[PDB]
Amino acid sequence: MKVYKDVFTNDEVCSDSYNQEDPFGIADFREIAFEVKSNKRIKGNGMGADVEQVIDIVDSFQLTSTSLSKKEYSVYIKNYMQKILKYLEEKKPDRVDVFKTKAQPLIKHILTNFDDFEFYMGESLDMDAGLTYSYYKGEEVTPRFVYISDGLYEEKF
């Protein structure tokens, strides 16, 4: 089973146990991002309850939700993109051009719709590493999680 890890913290944030789809249903963004549909999970683990309802992705990869102002996010994302580009030049130079080119419209899409998102840090809680984005599509009852693929690397157990 293949797992996806943040290139900076090495936290696991997704895996092939989840089917990947086009981010926001936009095929043109698949080149640098993908999304997965989450589902409810019972007792994944305050004073407790008998039936603890959680989101499978969050529980599985031990993600922690985090809130932040739109301005703080714009600052964070500008630096995170530079950090990824620096990383790509050093380890995956063939991705440098697409990322630089395609990142802008994806980020502009997120910013334009900033209030529709929840954000998640991985296990290391590193505010400088990648964030996983979550949103509810139409009238769906569980969220979809979007990942910026160049900020991740693949690993096999």
From Swiss-Prot:
Gene behind this protein: TCTP
Family named by the database record: Belongs to the TCTP family.
Entry annotated with the keyword Nucleotide-binding: no
Location relative to the cell: Cytoplasm
Keywords: Calcium, Cytoplasm
GO cellular component: cytoplasm
A Pfam family assignment: TCTP
SUPFAM superfamilies: Mss4-like
Extent of the signal sequence: none
Domain TCTP: 1-157
Organism whose genome encodes this protein: Plasmodium knowlesi
Function: Involved in calcium binding and microtubule stabilization.
A GO molecular-function descriptor: calcium ion binding
Protein name, entry field: Translationally-controlled tumor protein homolog
UniProt cross-references to Gene3D superfamilies, sorted A to Z: Metal Binding Protein, Guanine Nucleotide Exchange Factor, Chain A
InterPro entries xref list: Mss4-like_sf, Mss4/transl-control_tumour, TCTP, Translational_control_tumour_p
Main location: cytoplasm
